[PDB]
């Protein structure tokens, strides 16, 4: 069977490239970050603009939700992360210590920690309550494109333009595993699978790969899209059929069958690089967002 994602809403309002969209864990909201220095909150089901959250002095590259859906963290070119109370819109904490653009960020499931990756080639682990940087990992030798906690928070996966994917022990900060492949093309994105056993890694040779990271074996590859220049988010879609979902530099959203690797759908409508996609936690809904020549978020809905 194949999905039939259809366009439901186009969300306009950002005045520069959108950089990242994330659904709240409770399914109610979509958060978007933008080069226009703003976070915007939208209704996940009717597409209705809810609010604007502001305070970064430069554009934002990533945003992430706490498990209880009450907080956001954003990563900015202004070298800071900010922790935000969604209901009030207030900045609760400004996390300082990176020496270049902060690129990627995430909460752990407990949501007592934040992990960040930066152009300064480090991964930092931050205390949410106090805002203090707990650890600075000399993780990579080029900008860090993605950081993600596994399901119990005990592991972090990081990716970098240096061509490496690394698995880190959260508590000890030591590197547990380094994944290298072929001629080590830049790794533009990585994240754990929902069950925590796999990682999905994007490389700028137009390729996504599913890895058993402990065994160091590439189980799947997903190709056919265009990804040579940008750090594009990819996703496991698990609310219906088991798909892989990714944006693309040919302005399309691609959806693959996870097991067969075949493309099962291509979503048309954006007019610039689809830098970010996200999958709704309970419904067969995709959010997609695109760069400067587009500036919109689209919501798509499928029967499976």
């Amino acid at each position: 069977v194949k999905p039939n994602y259809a366009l439901k809403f186009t969300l306009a309002g950002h005045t520069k490239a959108v950089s990242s969209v994330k659904f709240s864990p409770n399914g109610e909201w979509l958060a978007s970050s933008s080069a226009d220095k703003l976070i915007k909150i939208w209704g996940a089901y009717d597409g209705k603009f809810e609010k604007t959250i502001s305070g970064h002095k430069l554009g934002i590259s990533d945003v992430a939700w706490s498990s209880d859906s009450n907080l956001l963290v954003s990563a900015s070119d202004d070298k800071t992360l900010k922790i935000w109370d969604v209901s009030s819109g207030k900045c609760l904490k400004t996390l300082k210590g990176h020496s270049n653009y902060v690129f990627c960020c995430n909460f752990n499931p407990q949501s007592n920690l934040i992990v960040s990756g930066s152009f300064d080639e480090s991964v930092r682990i931050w205390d949410v309550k106090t805002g203090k940087c707990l650890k600075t990992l000399p993780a990579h030798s080029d900008p860090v494109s993605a950081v993600h906690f596994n399901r119990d928070g005990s592991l972090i996966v990081s990716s970098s333009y240096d061509g490496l994917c690394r698995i880190w022990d959260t508590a000890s900060g030591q590197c547990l595993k380094t994944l290298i492949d072929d001629d080590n093309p830049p790794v533009s994105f990585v994240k754990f699978s929902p069950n925590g056993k796999y990682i999905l890694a994007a490389t700028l040779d137009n390729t996504l790969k599913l890895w058993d990271y402990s065994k160091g074996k590439c189980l799947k590859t997903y190709t056919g899209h265009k990804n040579e220049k940008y750090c594009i988010f990819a996703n496991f879609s698990v609310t219906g059929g088991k798909w892989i979902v990714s944006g693309s530099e040919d302005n399309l959203v691609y959806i693959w069958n996870l097991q067969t690797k075949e493309i099962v759908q291509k979503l048309q409508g954006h007019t610039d690089v689809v830098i970010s996609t996200a999958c709704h936690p309970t419904e067969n809904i995709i959010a997609s967002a695109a760069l400067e020549n587009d500036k919109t978020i689209k919501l798509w809905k499928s029967d499976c």
Binding site: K16, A17, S19, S20, S33, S34, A35, L58, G59, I60, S61, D62, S76, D77, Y101, F103, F119, P143, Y161, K229, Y230, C231, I275, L291, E292
Partner: peptide, 8 residues
């Protein structure tokens, strides 16, 4: 802008 929205 933002680093993610720039090529590299």
């Amino acid at each position: 802008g933002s680093a993610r929205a720039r090529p590299g």
